Every structure is written in C-alpha cells, then in structure tokens.
Structure 1
C-alpha cells in the first residue's frame, strides 16, 4: 500500500479554449437557443453558454458560447436565437477553430 511522494511537471501548453461573445437584452429576460449549421446545438460539458456578471446598470446580459475542446468538426456557422413575449431576434457568425485535416491523394 504505502509509499513516498513523487511528482512530475511537463512543458506548459496553451489550451484551445474559445469563446463566441454574445449580448442579450429584453424584458422580461429572453430565452436562448443556439444553432450549429442550422440545427439545434445541444450544450455539452465542452460546449455551453456562460454568462458574465451583471453590471448593476443595464438589462443586457453578456456571455460566451464557450468551446473547450473544439476541432475542425466544430468549424461552421453559429446562430443565437433569443425570444421574449415582445419579440424575437437572431444573430449569425461563422467560426473556424482548427484547419481541415490533411488528406492524402
């Protein structure tokens, strides 16, 4: 069972944590939904919505659709849809996180 403490460090590396910045306003507070290339994007533990802190001033809410482990499969068009009783809005953005994989001939 019992033995001495051992430890090991490696070369520091930058992760590929990305953020698609967004702002959302409306009262009552709207609901959000994302689309990836036109279809519902279901949030996982590696792709999820995250809000920044509320200013104390405005009604807006700022945040990120965070992507912690993106690869070329995640390259595409992203849309955020918001809706409240008084109206519905949408905004598109194209994003690329990694080049497309090399293919031989």
Structure 2
C-alpha cells in the first residue's frame, strides 16, 4: 500500500540576491512530495516572465533538497521590493522572505 512512506514536508531556504547584472536569488526547498513553488512579490502574485524566471535545477537523487534560483536576466527597478517564496505540499507550506534592491538608473 505504501511505496513512499517517507513524507518529507517542504522547508524553504532563501538566499540573499547576489548583485550582478544577472541577479540570482538562490533557493533550496526540500521534500519528497513536490511542493508548488510560488513567488509573492509585495503581497502580489509574481508571475514569471522571460526576464524574471524560476530555475529548477536537477537535484541529486540522494538529497531531498530541490535547488534553484530566481534569476533575473534583465532586472527592472519595479522589482525593487519584497520577494517571498511559498512552497506548499500535502504535509505543509513553508515560506521564506527575500527583500532585494533592484535599483536602476534609467538610461
């Protein structure tokens, strides 16, 4: 009846965005039941674009942690606000918040 008894719930680790033109917010979310990862931006639903994209990198089969980065190839000063990662799986929902400074100087 059980094929996967191991129910690892989702915990969310976020990391400070690294300042470089291609901004990267590295994340680590662990769990075997796959949690839905959603970014919240200033309390509003952040939807990924071609400029702002969530990277899901291939984890090792021996680690329970899923890794990735919210990478912004082309950053915009409207992104200068609060980011929050919500991961929800059957066991539970985890959250971590990241407030990054995307400050542009037009032209």
TM-score tier (shorter): 0.7 to 0.9
Q: Which has the larger radius of gyration?
A: 1
- Report the count of equivalent residues: 101
Relative contact order higher in (CA < 8 Å, ≥ 6 apart): 2
Q: How much has 1:54 moved relative to structure 2?
A: 1.3
User: How far, CA to CA, are the matches of 1:84 and 1:4 in structure 2?
Assistant: 7
Counterparts in 2 of 1:26 and 1:12: CA distance versus 1, 3 Å: closer
Aligned residues of 2:18 and 2:24 also touching (Cα < 8 A): no
Q: Which runs of 5+ in 2 are unaligned?
A: 1-5
User: How far, CA to CA, are the matches of 1:62 and 1:8 in structure 2?
Assistant: 9
User: How far, CA to CA, are the matches of 1:3 and 1:35 in structure 2?
Assistant: 23
Structure 1 stretch displaced more, 18-27 or 8-17: 8-17
Q: TM-score, normalised by structure 1?
A: 0.75
SS of the residue corresponding to residue 78 of structure 2 reads: helix
Q: Which runs of 5+ in 1 are unaligned?
A: none
SS of the residue corresponding to residue 87 of structure 2 reads: strand
Q: TM-score, normalised by structure 2?
A: 0.74
